[PDB]
C-alpha cells in the first residue's frame, strides 16, 4: 500500500525537511568511528511516505495517547536510522525494528540530532560499514534516513550520560546530561506510536 511521492527542491516542504536535517548534525564522542566524518549532507531526494493503513494506524493510537494525556499528544518530528527502513516504510514499525541493547531497554528509538540517527543506517556502531566499500565513513554510497512523526504523551525524563513502558508513561526521553551540545533521544515501545513520514536520501559530505 505504500506509495513514495518525490518533493521538488523548490518545495517548501522540502526547504523545511533539510534545514531540520543539516542544522542538527553535530560532533559525535566516537570522533566520527560509527557514522563517518562529515559537518553536514548533499540531499539527493526527499519523498513523502504515502500509507492510509499505516497512517490510520498511528492517528488511532495518537488518540488514545493524547485522551490519556489531558488531550495532549506530544506529537514531534524525530529522525530514525535504521538497516529496516525499507521494511518500515512497506510494513510501519513494528518489534523486529527495535534496539534491543539499547539504554533504555528494548523500544524503537529516535533523535532528535540528524547525525545521531546517521550512526545508525548500517547498523549498530554503523556495522561494517556500506555495503559496497565497507567503509562507514563513506562519501560516495546513498544513505537513508527517515523523518518520522513521533507520539511521545507522557515521557519518562532519564538523565543520562520489546520492553514496556515505566508505569504510567507512554515513551522514555534520554535527556544528555554530560555532552553539553547533545540533543535528546527519545524511545517508544509500540509501533504504532510513529508513523515514517519522509523518506530523506543523502551521502554524508568530506570536510573540505
Ligand atoms: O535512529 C536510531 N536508530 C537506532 C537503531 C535502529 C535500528 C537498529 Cl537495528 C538499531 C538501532 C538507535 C538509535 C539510538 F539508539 C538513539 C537515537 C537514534 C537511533
Ligand atoms: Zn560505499
Not at 492510509?52 to 536510522?81: C, D, I, P, Q
Not at 560499514?129 to 519518562?156: A, E, M, N, W
Not at 534520554?174 to 524511545?187: F, K, T
Request: aromatic residues 12%; contains cysteine.
Amino acid at each position: 500500500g505504500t506509495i513514495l511521492i518525490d518533493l521538488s527542491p523548490d518545495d517548501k516542504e522540502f526547504q523545511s525537511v533539510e534545514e531540520e536535517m543539516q542544522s542538527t548534525v553535530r560532533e559525535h564522542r566516537d570522533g566520527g568511528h560509527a557514522g563517518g566524518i562529515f559537518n553536514r549532507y548533499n540531499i539527493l531526494k526527499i519523498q513523502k511516505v504515502c500509507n492510509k493503513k499505516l497512517w490510520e494506524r498511528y492517528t488511532h493510537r495518537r488518540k488514545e495517547v493524547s485522551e490519556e494525556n489531558h488531550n495532549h499528544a506530544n506529537e514531534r518530528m524525530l529522525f530514525h536510522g535504521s538497516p529496516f527502513v525499507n521494511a518500515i516504510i512497506h510494513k510501519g514499525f513494528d518489534e523486529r525494528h527495535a534496539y534491543i541493547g539499547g539504554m533504555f531497554g528494548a523500544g524503537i528509538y529516535f533523535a532528535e540530532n540528524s547525525s545521531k540517527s546517521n550512526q545508525y543506517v548500517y547498523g549498530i556502531g554503523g556495522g561494517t560499514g556500506c555495503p559496497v566499500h565497507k567503509d562507514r565513513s563513506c562519501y560516495i554510497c546513498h544513505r537513508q534516513l527517515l523523518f518520522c512523526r513521533v507520539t511521545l504523551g507522557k515521557s519518562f525524563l532519564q538523565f543520562s550520560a520489546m520492553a514496556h513502558s515505566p508505569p504510567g508513561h507512554h515513551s522514555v526521553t534520554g535527556r544528555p546530561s554530560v555532552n553539553g551540545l547533545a540533543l535528546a533521544e527519545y524511545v517508544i515501545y509500540r509501533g504504532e506510536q510513529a508513523y515514517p513520514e519522509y523518506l530523506i536520501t543523502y551521502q554524508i559530505m568530506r570536510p573540505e
